[PDB]
């Protein structure tokens, strides 16, 4: 069953609290 | 061509790693910018970024298939 935490803030702020960014 | 996936995990707050932000192309570059602005580890993992992007939406906790690989990603990011 899918699990969400769908409300969040801006792009800048989400990144500032982020743990790791994974890229290709 | 370019993907970035932003994961957030805080023990006792996020039950699992949360994909808080995703971006392709211009927004991927922005995220990898902003991650350098705020000093957040960026790891290049082509298979993991691509599968996360294709399966886990923005605002969604990772599913069971990603537990082991994301655990390892996070451990690697931790130090760094």
TrEMBL record, chain A:
Record localization: Cell membrane
Taxonomic superkingdom: Bacteria
Family: Belongs to the type III secretion exporter family.
Protein name per the record: T3SS structure protein EscU
Species for this entry: Escherichia coli O157:H7
Gene (name only): escU
Positions spanned in the full protein: 239 to 262 of 345
TrEMBL record, chain B:
Compartments it resides in: Cell membrane
GO molecular function: dioxygenase activity; isomerase activity
Signal peptide: none
GO terms under biological process: protein secretion
One GO CC annotation: plasma membrane
Annotated keywords: Cell membrane, Dioxygenase, Isomerase, Membrane, Oxidoreductase, Transmembrane, Transmembrane helix
Record family assignment: Belongs to the type III secretion exporter family.
This protein's name: EscU
Included stretch of the parent chain: 264 to 343 of 345
